[PDB]
Design an enzyme around this catalytic site. Structure first.
Site, mmCIF file in Angstrom:
data_model
loop_
_atom_site.group_PDB
_atom_site.id
_atom_site.type_symbol
_atom_site.label_atom_id
_atom_site.label_comp_id
_atom_site.label_asym_id
_atom_site.label_seq_id
_atom_site.Cartn_x
_atom_site.Cartn_y
_atom_site.Cartn_z
ATOM 1 N N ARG A 80 16.619 5.258 -4.361
ATOM 2 C CA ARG A 80 15.365 6.001 -4.171
ATOM 3 C C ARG A 80 14.720 5.743 -2.831
ATOM 4 O O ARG A 80 13.531 6.004 -2.661
ATOM 5 C CB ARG A 80 14.361 5.762 -5.317
ATOM 6 N N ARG A 103 8.234 -0.473 6.183
ATOM 7 C CA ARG A 103 7.684 -1.774 6.590
ATOM 8 C C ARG A 103 8.622 -2.938 6.214
ATOM 9 O O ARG A 103 8.711 -3.931 6.931
ATOM 10 C CB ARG A 103 6.288 -1.995 5.990
ATOM 11 N N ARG A 115 -3.271 -3.114 14.880
ATOM 12 C CA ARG A 115 -2.683 -3.036 13.537
ATOM 13 C C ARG A 115 -1.356 -3.779 13.439
ATOM 14 O O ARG A 115 -1.113 -4.463 12.467
ATOM 15 C CB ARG A 115 -2.506 -1.583 13.067
ATOM 16 N N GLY A 147 4.207 -2.318 0.296
ATOM 17 C CA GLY A 147 4.286 -1.037 -0.427
ATOM 18 C C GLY A 147 5.268 -0.054 0.193
ATOM 19 O O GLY A 147 6.056 0.594 -0.510
ATOM 20 N N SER A 178 -1.903 -3.591 2.537
ATOM 21 C CA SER A 178 -3.212 -3.238 3.083
ATOM 22 C C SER A 178 -4.223 -3.029 1.949
ATOM 23 O O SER A 178 -3.847 -2.892 0.792
ATOM 24 C CB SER A 178 -3.096 -1.961 3.910
HETATM 25 N N1 LIG Z 1 9.251 4.928 -19.353
HETATM 26 C C1 LIG Z 1 10.328 5.671 -19.028
HETATM 27 N N2 LIG Z 1 10.250 6.510 -17.962
HETATM 28 C C2 LIG Z 1 11.318 7.265 -17.614
HETATM 29 C C3 LIG Z 1 12.551 7.156 -18.417
HETATM 30 N N3 LIG Z 1 13.448 8.002 -17.872
HETATM 31 C C4 LIG Z 1 12.849 8.593 -16.812
HETATM 32 N N4 LIG Z 1 11.581 8.167 -16.660
HETATM 33 C C5 LIG Z 1 10.670 8.610 -15.606
HETATM 34 O O1 LIG Z 1 11.260 8.270 -14.360
HETATM 35 C C6 LIG Z 1 10.737 7.079 -13.752
HETATM 36 C C7 LIG Z 1 11.621 5.862 -14.038
HETATM 37 O O2 LIG Z 1 12.866 5.890 -13.323
HETATM 38 C C8 LIG Z 1 12.537 6.212 -19.564
HETATM 39 O O3 LIG Z 1 13.547 6.069 -20.289
HETATM 40 N N5 LIG Z 1 11.412 5.527 -19.801
HETATM 41 N N1 LIG Z 2 -7.729 2.428 -3.625
HETATM 42 C C1 LIG Z 2 -7.407 1.988 -2.392
HETATM 43 N N2 LIG Z 2 -6.200 1.394 -2.200
HETATM 44 C C2 LIG Z 2 -5.852 0.947 -0.971
HETATM 45 C C3 LIG Z 2 -6.810 1.115 0.138
HETATM 46 N N3 LIG Z 2 -6.232 0.589 1.237
HETATM 47 C C4 LIG Z 2 -5.011 0.133 0.868
HETATM 48 N N4 LIG Z 2 -4.785 0.333 -0.444
HETATM 49 C C5 LIG Z 2 -3.560 -0.042 -1.148
HETATM 50 O O1 LIG Z 2 -2.486 0.660 -0.540
HETATM 51 C C6 LIG Z 2 -2.054 1.831 -1.249
HETATM 52 C C7 LIG Z 2 -2.674 3.106 -0.670
HETATM 53 O O2 LIG Z 2 -2.130 3.466 0.609
HETATM 54 C C8 LIG Z 2 -8.104 1.775 -0.172
HETATM 55 O O3 LIG Z 2 -8.964 1.951 0.720
HETATM 56 N N5 LIG Z 2 -8.323 2.168 -1.432
#
Ligand SMILES: Nc1nc2c(ncn2COCCO)c(=O)[nH]1
Ligand SMILES: Nc1nc2c(ncn2COCCO)c(=O)[nH]1
Ligand SMILES: Nc1nc2c(ncn2COCCO)c(=O)[nH]1
Ligand SMILES: Nc1nc2c(ncn2COCCO)c(=O)[nH]1
Ligand SMILES: Nc1nc2c(ncn2COCCO)c(=O)[nH]1
Ligand SMILES: Nc1nc2c(ncn2COCCO)c(=O)[nH]1
EC number: 2.4.2.1
Lengths: 237, 237, 237, 237, 237, 237
Positions: free
Chosen positions: A43, A24, A217, A20, A90
């Site tokens: 991004r 990492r 960890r 995620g 995680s």
């Molecule tokens: N679903 C969708 N989300 C968007 C669009 N343009 C911007 N977003 C929102 O930003 C997150 C995606 O880069 C689009 O054309 N479609």
């Molecule tokens: N909902 C939820 N998502 C988790 C948990 N631990 C890891 N994740 C998934 O990772 C995204 C959140 O940091 C948790 O305790 N609850």
């Protein structure tokens, strides 16, 4: 290039590890991959490609939540020739017997997201991993002396759930780990014809528990990544 | 500190601008904020605090999708004393009269997410902005010579939707912009008692259109941020 | 004439005020309009047209409930050239800080109806008012020395709710008042391309006790109607 | 005895093979089990117990459909000490590459039933098999020279589907076979803490044409049953 | 007195006929009852009590839609000792062989309202009339030599439906007439422990816009009212 | 011949009684019919044709659950010219005043199955019996001096329900008996254009585990069968 990945066909391997956190991913490229090259910074979603014992591998962040990972995994599959996605993350535990630092392998992923209902005419799509990828991961784990649990994850849309009672339901039905992605990734994999696995490390217990040290960890995180990387090599045979 | 924000009470202003991209947050801090200080780097979700014409302001990425922004906005409100959230993003247009580079202000946000149904016993929660924040933004826009449209956004869980026909339904019911966050942010704001607005810039038209230059994109992005920052100052009066 | 309005193009103004009660439509015409003529009596749903400070204005009952007001508002929009609907009604409060005789303006309307789901492919449509109409109402109220609350209404299908746990949920999510129409009217307005607003006075506090007023009530009711009519004049420029 | 099984603790093995057809349970007992005794006849749902290479094994019909097989599997688990259920059935294929007489192993099972939603607070439960049982079956099939396909089944409530657009959706999302039980059985197994697996042979190609085989069929059916029984021996170690 | 009915325990008969139109309640009181006194005019929802061949009978409008008639039917049952409700309304036909002016008796009522789902934990509540009331109306119609069909109504929330295809589904499943009340009335009768029936006459075809005159429409309107009143007499024996 | 019935056009009467248990179909053929010949034994689902006072009558098990009985009832209607289906089953009571061995006639059937929602665009299809068949069974029971209640059954997918609270809801809404078929049979009759009724006798209370003997149970089982057969004779006139 795709709207979220500034790269071209062949910049990614046909297998991508995806934590995620993109920081990492950088850690993974530095620690485990040889001849690594940055292939994405759009991004700040850092992505890398290198080799692990000769095998071309990529690693890239996917961000938190089904909608984020659904974008990256889709673009990877349809525009970069990616065949396998391994989420390496995680999760929080609900079962008392499941401990901090356990490695959980998500053969299935429950969810409270609506994305698979949108895909599947509002019926129940069983969001599942590719079976060979599951077994590869179990075997790699066994060869490294780690005993992974295999079962259901729950992919939550809301980390801060207003529905506390749902954790008891998860417990009752055997959910091994709560995370935010697997069901989304498995859905994309089925939509676009590729294969996926989610492996998670238990970092929280939504019941007691105690906690762990940064050295512990790091060790289990490294263990999870070893399991993912070795599983790929078993898969190629 | 919260699990996704390594910071303490008072590191954030009571108002936070949130683009999806954390690199845009850094750009915002550099370009518009004085005396800026980095306050978050967890997961590369860069966050900053400084001043704009004397007014303490923070800016931080939220990542793509309802579940990501729901984490950050929640933690900000409950642990950092944040009162107003302004999402500052991009969106795709469905209405032919809505053009590339238009500024759209989301007084409401439709969604295909299930998060507000989970909150609201499976009924229809009208995910709305705070009204004063909407009017502040409209007035700031008018004072800068930009004519913003006010209406419904659609917060999509799937950027790559398998339901193409839904864009025609959005068009029919007047949706100004498609993005991935507003309904989630407005839901969190209602759950935890704060106020929210989403302003978006049209970066795509899911019909024709042509496209734009990088200089044009930067100008309208700057215009959107000016609108957000000036709206805050009107709000304080 | 339409199946529920025995009148012809021109008999209504392009703005229609609408209470639930047709007897209150007559109250409004008689009290506030000059040269007022009755233009409908089908099913006893009295409608009137006259002038308010020289401006042609209509007022007509809509009946109780989404299905009733959806008929009248639709036929007015598609067959009588009506461009703005202003619902002028009563509602019940669930928040402690919301008092008897507060004027509430429904910027959005939640609902337990299925009508917007039917329209919007079972997704969440945010049923919202026209922004300009909302701000005209806020300003008209400020000129009269009244501080209108702007936020979410809840449009209930069941006045006698099977279980009142939903009122606690409404209260948690900041619902200003409970009535039976706004979400339906906002849906019709978006379906058929017109503009709408709901203004209500608080007639009841479903929470508590419920300590009472005089009439008084009736002067607050007249203030609502004056806000509505004056907001129309502001909207004309 | 339970309301649907006239037998006593000990009459069943701790593993039960289950075809839909009770006549096929008798076929299996007679063909594959030594010292086979009938242990149930309530409602004609024949169950038998005997030995396969010295290992105590039962076989009993479950009837057609989730509600039928949910009764039998539950009562077996909670009243007869049964720890593993192996459904051994037929299914219809929707994918072109899936042929008549392919053995498919249901690692997961999609469904249009509401039973798992009832269990899981209207969220998506991923109805999955026990992992070890799945891999025992794959290995037992490999030892017999058969290449089993592992993936998703679809457990339909309506054999005669009101509209077959759902088959195209099943095909898009990689469904290996359509049957009427697996998702229900996997739900019961998770509810009541046991292990389950569904193995099916392809009896039909709902797609095409549907060009046919001999019997042949019957030898592939026997291979399924041999895979099931041998997988039990692998599971014992 | 209740919030929508200014009257006292005793002012209504134990049986109430309810057309949607309060003006037709008036016509019924004038044409069929004797010693008819007005017992309600709140919101113009005219209610009358009188006698039919010496039997005390009331008749009162219920307004258009499930929410309207749910208010009035509830109040009648809980506060005025009403035992039986007979709706006497119009409906639209979807079956080509159901002709204008046919009398339809709603033994069941389908709906796209959410009210019964809210009552019944989101499952399917079969909204049904009281069997004896249905039998009484079939026999009253036989004795008066009037043709009358028994089966399912469909109670719609949207008279002006955005989903024309649903009428084909209603057609497919034998829906005799489309109205806006029955399913709500039958749910109220079930919830509050009274009895109900809906009788309707087909005043148009959803498909067509077919033509009649004021001679036949009232004579058929009168046929339904005769059936209803005579059916009550039979119920008394 | 159909996939579940080895027989030909003519082997069945135009009316078929269907208990769930094929062994009770056998008992009925032995005890009540004359010149009874077996016409089906596929999957052990025994079907018999014979005569009752010279009237050609068939009787065949349908298995437990909506999916099972939907298969057999469909095939009977589309391929064997069956016009009427009468289910003759057991049910559980939830009302304290409905006693063991009471005869219940399902004029409607509630359900937690999704089958009718799939047929009816996710709206509420009121699953109803044929009115004349209901009348015939009420009169047959009267003529034989047997008590019989008319109203709603509830057709459950889970005999062993994880949601005990739903029984309180069934109780609240007057559900006379809980079984597993009627709503599915009534949906099939509607879809394929035939007629159906469900009659049941209460063989236990969901709440209790109350006691009887084999003398009374069969005499009441016989009471229901007499009603069913005599009701057919009345239908013929
Ligand atoms: N679903 C969708 N989300 C968007 C669009 N343009 C911007 N977003 C929102 O930003 C997150 C995606 O880069 C689009 O054309 N479609
Ligand atoms: N909902 C939820 N998502 C988790 C948990 N631990 C890891 N994740 C998934 O990772 C995204 C959140 O940091 C948790 O305790 N609850
Ligand atoms: N559902 C509901 N509607 C209301 C309330 N107060 C006013 N209305 C609008 O209904 C007007 C008819 O009484 C309330 O508390 N609840
Ligand atoms: N729904 C469905 N069930 C099947 C199919 N093939 C086998 N089964 C399982 O039902 C066994 C009874 O025929 C199929 O194509 N569809
Ligand atoms: N929804 C709907 N209701 C009807 C129709 N005809 C009569 N009713 C009963 O209520 C509507 C009153 O105008 C119709 O065509 N559609
Ligand atoms: N769901 C359910 N069905 C029943 C009950 N009693 C009889 N039936 C009808 O089918 C069940 C057969 O065992 C009951 O208590 N619950």
């Amino acid at each position: 290039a795709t709207p979220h990945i500034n790269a071209e066909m062949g910049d990614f391997a046909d297998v991508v590890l995806m934590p995620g956190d993109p920081l990492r991913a950088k850690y993974i490229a530095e620690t485990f991959l040889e001849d690594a090259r940055e292939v994405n910074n759009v991004r700040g979603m850092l992505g890398f490609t290198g080799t692990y014992k000769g095998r071309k591998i990529s690693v890239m962040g996917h961000g938190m939540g089904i909608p984020s990972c659904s974008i990256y995994t889709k673009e990877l599959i349809t525009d970069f020739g990616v065949k396998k996605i391994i989420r390496v993350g995680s999760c929080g535990a609900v079962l008392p017997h499941v401990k901090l630092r356990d490695v959980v392998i998500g053969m299935g992923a429950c969810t409270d997201s609506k994305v698979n209902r949108i895909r599947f005419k509002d019926h129940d799509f069983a969001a599942i991993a590719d079976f060979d990828m599951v077994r590869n991961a179990v075997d790699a784990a066994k060869a490294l002396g780690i005993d992974a649990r295999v079962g259901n994850l729950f992919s939550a849309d809301l980390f801060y759930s207003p529905d506390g009672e749902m954790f008891d339901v998860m417990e009752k039905y055997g959910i091994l780990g709560v995370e935010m992605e697997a069901a989304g990734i498995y859905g994309v994999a089925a939509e676009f014809g590729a294969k996926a696995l989610t492996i998670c490390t238990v970092s929280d217990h939504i019941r007691t528990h105690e906690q762990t040290t940064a050295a512990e960890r790091q060790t289990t995180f490294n263990d999870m990544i070893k399991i993912a990387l070795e599983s790929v090599l078993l898969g190629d045979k």
